[PDB]
Chains A and B, each alone.
Chain A
């Protein structure tokens, strides 16, 4: 509903992939765990917690899914490329 406030610049690089209207960026396990922490108390990962210790990778992903309909974001725990609607929920594979 709302817009995540803009945290200055230095946005992590998102690789354009017009081959399938997709995009690739390496986030890491800390973000994929943090966002997994985000969607467990009813909270939001698209725009909530603007003063986060790891807000930057969260803010870019939100714009990236708007720019690209089938984003391809890869973690490091297993290195899987979860897609845009696979990134929609915030629950990746397992765990509470």
Chain B
């Protein structure tokens, strides 16, 4: 839904998928993609539970 990048797998974050990690190279920036995904997920709780 509102937390999904249009080219992702909609339920799993894949560390080998360039859409999921927003084109990050190297582990040093591949992880911050997970960080941003966690942040993106959190706000969706605020939108739904209120």
Contact = CB atoms under 8 A, between A and B. Distances in A.
Interface of A: 15, 17, 19-20, 24, 72, 74, 76, 79, 81
B9 interface: yes
Contacts, number: 22
Chief secondary structure at chain A's binding surface: strand
Interface of B: 7-9, 14, 16-19, 23, 25
Chief secondary structure at chain B's binding surface: loop
B35 to A, nearest CB: 19
A72 B18 contact: yes
Given A15-B16, A19-B7, A74-B18, 4 more contacts: A15-B17, A17-B14, A20-B19, A81-B18
B21 to A, nearest CB: 10
A19 B8 contact: yes
B17 A19 contact: yes
A74 B29 CA distance: 15
Contacts of B19: 19-20
Nearest to A75: B25
Contacts of B25: 74, 76, 79
A13 to B, nearest CB: 9
Contacts of B9: 19
A12 to B, nearest CB: 13
Contacts of A74: 18, 25
